[PDB]
Scaffold this active site. Structure first.
Site, PDB file in Angstrom:
ATOM      1  N   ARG A   1       0.849  -1.206   0.000  1.00  0.00           N
ATOM      2  CA  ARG A   1       0.000   0.000   0.000  1.00  0.00           C
ATOM      3  C   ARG A   1       0.880   1.250   0.000  1.00  0.00           C
ATOM      4  NH1 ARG A   1      -4.288  -1.390   4.585  1.00  0.00           N
ATOM      5  NH2 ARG A   1      -4.663   0.883   4.455  1.00  0.00           N
TER       6      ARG A   1
ATOM      7  N   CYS B   1      -0.273   7.065   8.575  1.00  0.00           N
ATOM      8  CA  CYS B   1      -0.691   5.745   8.064  1.00  0.00           C
ATOM      9  C   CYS B   1      -1.911   5.970   7.172  1.00  0.00           C
ATOM     10  CB  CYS B   1      -0.877   4.773   9.206  1.00  0.00           C
ATOM     11  SG  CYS B   1      -2.162   5.203  10.381  1.00  0.00           S
ATOM     12  N   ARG B   2      -2.894   5.108   7.232  1.00  0.00           N
ATOM     13  CA  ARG B   2      -4.153   5.279   6.516  1.00  0.00           C
ATOM     14  C   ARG B   2      -5.060   6.302   7.172  1.00  0.00           C
ATOM     15  NH1 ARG B   2      -7.962   2.655   3.085  1.00  0.00           N
ATOM     16  NH2 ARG B   2      -9.964   3.471   3.814  1.00  0.00           N
ATOM     17  N   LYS B   3      -5.248   6.259   8.467  1.00  0.00           N
ATOM     18  CA  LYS B   3      -6.313   6.991   9.182  1.00  0.00           C
ATOM     19  C   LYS B   3      -5.834   7.402  10.561  1.00  0.00           C
ATOM     20  CE  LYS B   3      -9.066   3.392   8.709  1.00  0.00           C
ATOM     21  NZ  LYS B   3     -10.260   2.504   8.904  1.00  0.00           N
ATOM     22  N   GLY B   4      -4.533   7.316  10.853  1.00  0.00           N
ATOM     23  CA  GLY B   4      -4.020   7.771  12.143  1.00  0.00           C
ATOM     24  C   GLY B   4      -4.046   6.727  13.241  1.00  0.00           C
ATOM     25  N   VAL B   5      -4.279   5.491  12.931  1.00  0.00           N
ATOM     26  CA  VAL B   5      -4.411   4.390  13.907  1.00  0.00           C
ATOM     27  C   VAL B   5      -3.093   3.673  14.000  1.00  0.00           C
ATOM     28  CG1 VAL B   5      -5.648   2.276  14.466  1.00  0.00           C
ATOM     29  CG2 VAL B   5      -6.936   4.278  13.681  1.00  0.00           C
ATOM     30  N   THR B   6      -2.634   2.961  13.013  1.00  0.00           N
ATOM     31  CA  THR B   6      -1.399   2.167  13.158  1.00  0.00           C
ATOM     32  C   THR B   6      -0.155   3.048  13.274  1.00  0.00           C
ATOM     33  OG1 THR B   6      -0.909   1.757  10.836  1.00  0.00           O
ATOM     34  CG2 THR B   6      -2.471   0.286  11.904  1.00  0.00           C
TER      35      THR B   6
ATOM     36  N   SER C   1      -3.770  11.629   8.038  1.00  0.00           N
ATOM     37  CA  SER C   1      -3.077  10.475   7.430  1.00  0.00           C
ATOM     38  C   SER C   1      -3.396  10.417   5.926  1.00  0.00           C
ATOM     39  CB  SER C   1      -3.434   9.207   8.244  1.00  0.00           C
ATOM     40  OG  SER C   1      -2.438   8.975   9.260  1.00  0.00           O
TER      41      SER C   1
HETATM   42 NA    NA Z   1      -7.502   9.932  11.842  1.00  0.00          NA
END
Ligand code: NA
EC number: 2.8.1.1
Length: 291
Positions: free
Chosen positions: A187, A248-253, A275
């Site tokens: 990704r 990352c994708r959405k601020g989680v990992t 992200s």
């Molecule tokens: Na986020």
């Protein structure tokens, strides 16, 4: 101080089981299941209702977010966070321990650890090994209802632990911060699509380095040692003495990068909450690359 005195970011399953047996869950110690799964997969709240650490609450990340945002898993307001965690029995004096049910051992728990820190609460830890290892070790689980007494929490945003779109765009030019992206390699490179979205291309922000989050865990789902974590940053040319933004994708990992760095003595990693999901929608295409 040259280095802040850091509060423990990991607790063991043995420590948490001893604490639960001793009746320590209460105003002083609250336990959260923060699991979230992509649509059409596992059922986070149902799994919680069937099996949780005794006295644990479900932390609903779908609810505890800015639902008005067009972007994914954005921080709520200070008041929204404070009202929600006070309803789970958490005050400013509470030790918060977070776990999730990820099959390797961690996915959303570090995000909630960071949320507490970004709202000014240092007394927060993740369960090392997750619910995976709680289960594998045979520690107690219940379906009994948790009904914590309400508490008061004061949330104060620590803006040093957050980055906005505008700050990440300025950093393309300034190069003041190293930008580290925790998405899976395919990704990040753009050879695998972004899932669970319409028309969201994969690729990465120019100048960013890739540290896929699952490389921070052992095969059994425990955190790697501080010596291993430091070696991983060094081999990726990430200098822990220099400023660092995780994305990352959405601020989680991304919060796994922040946790890894914290265990190496670097608490100042900021999360680009918007992200890639925000970046792709807002930024010029000249700012990102894809194979
Ligand atoms: Na986020």
């Amino acid at each position: 101080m040259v280095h802040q005195v850091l509060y423990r970011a990991l607790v063991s399953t043995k420590w948490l089981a001893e604490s639960v047996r001793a009746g320590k869950v209460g105003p002083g110690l609250r336990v959260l299941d923060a699991s979230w799964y992509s649509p059409g997969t596992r059922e986070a709240r149902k799994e919680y209702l069937e099996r949780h650490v005794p006295g644990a609450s479900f932390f609903d990340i779908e609810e505890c977010r800015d639902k008005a945002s067009p972007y994914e898993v954005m921080l709520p307001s200070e008041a929204g966070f404070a009202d929600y965690v006070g309803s789970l029995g958490i005050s400013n004096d509470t030790h918060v321990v977070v776990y999730d049910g990820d099959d390797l051992g961690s996915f959303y728990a570090p995000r909630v650890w960071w949320m507490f820190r970004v709202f000014g609460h240092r007394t927060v830890s993740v369960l090392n090994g997750g619910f995976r290892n709680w289960l594998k070790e045979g520690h107690p689980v219940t379906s009994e209802p948790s009904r914590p007494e309400p508490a008061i929490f004061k949330a104060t945003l620590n803006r040093s632990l957050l980055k906005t779109y505008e700050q990440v765009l300025e950093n393309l030019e300034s190069k003041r911060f190293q930008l580290v992206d925790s998405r899976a390699q395919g990704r990040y490179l753009g050879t695998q699509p972004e899932p669970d979205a319409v028309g969201l291309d994969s690729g990465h922000i120019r100048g960013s380095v890739n540290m896929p989050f699952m490389n921070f865990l052992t095969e059994d789902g425990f955190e790697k040692s501080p010596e291993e974590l430091r070696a991983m940053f060094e081999a990726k040319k990430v200098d822990l003495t220099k400023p660092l933004i995780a994305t990352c994708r959405k601020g989680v990992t991304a919060c796994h990068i922040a946790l890894a760095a914290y265990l190496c003595g670097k608490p100042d990693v900021a999360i680009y909450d918007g992200s890639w999901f925000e970046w792709f929608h807002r930024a010029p295409p000249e700012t990102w690359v894809s194979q």
